[PDB]
Design a protein around this ligand. Sequence first.
Ligand SMILES: CC(=O)SCCNC(=O)CCNC(=O)[C@H](O)C(C)(C)COP(=O)(O)OP(=O)(O)OC[C@H]1O[C@@H](n2cnc3c(N)ncnc32)[C@H](O)[C@@H]1OP(=O)(O)O
Ligand SMILES: [Ca+2]
Length: 157
Amino acid sequence: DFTLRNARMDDIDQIIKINRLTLPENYPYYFFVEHLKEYGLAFFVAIVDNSVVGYIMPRIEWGFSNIKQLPSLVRKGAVVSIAVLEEYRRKGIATTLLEASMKSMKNDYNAEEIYLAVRVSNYPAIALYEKLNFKKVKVLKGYYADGEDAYLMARPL
Ligand SMILES: CC(=O)SCCNC(=O)CCNC(=O)[C@H](O)C(C)(C)COP(=O)(O)OP(=O)(O)OC[C@H]1O[C@@H](n2cnc3c(N)ncnc32)[C@H](O)[C@@H]1OP(=O)(O)O
Ligand SMILES: [Ca+2]
């Protein structure tokens, strides 16, 4: 009893509120907009009865691989941000969001790998990512504003 669709401009202040409720990393309005315009096909929301209850915001880029050691550039997707409102957690929504985004990154944007950063103490997200075959690649020391470390996590597409 949730449905998944691509995010639209009208979704964004609902998205921003979700972000502010669930996450310390609170991006300004234009940030969400630029990513919706640039990588929209992989940017999904989860809807319950006309309200947004979750989102995933993607990025697509050229960069060096986290999966293999090559001197040349590869096309990568990144999970910039993902959140599901507490009320609707453990229903498979974050899983459905990430799979939908990964599919688009692969098919619409020709990314060959995806990565993200997650707090070393965010054990629910880590568990989620690991169930989706994400692996720990690196520890990013003092990555977050409050000084906490991050796992850089990655997987092939
Ligand atoms: C920005 C970044 O890239 S990292 C930040 C991630 N987002 C946040 O921290 C915001 C606060 N937290 C949340 O919004 C959610 O808890 C999320 C995004 C981590 C997961 O949302 P959910 O919809 O509940 O995840 P989902 O239902 O798809 O769970 C799938 C699997 O993930 C694991 N998992 C998810 N949440 C938990 C949890 N609290 N405790 C233990 N395992 C969990 C489980 O193995 C779960 O499988 P199962 O429920 O069938 O046993
Ligand atoms: Ca985190």
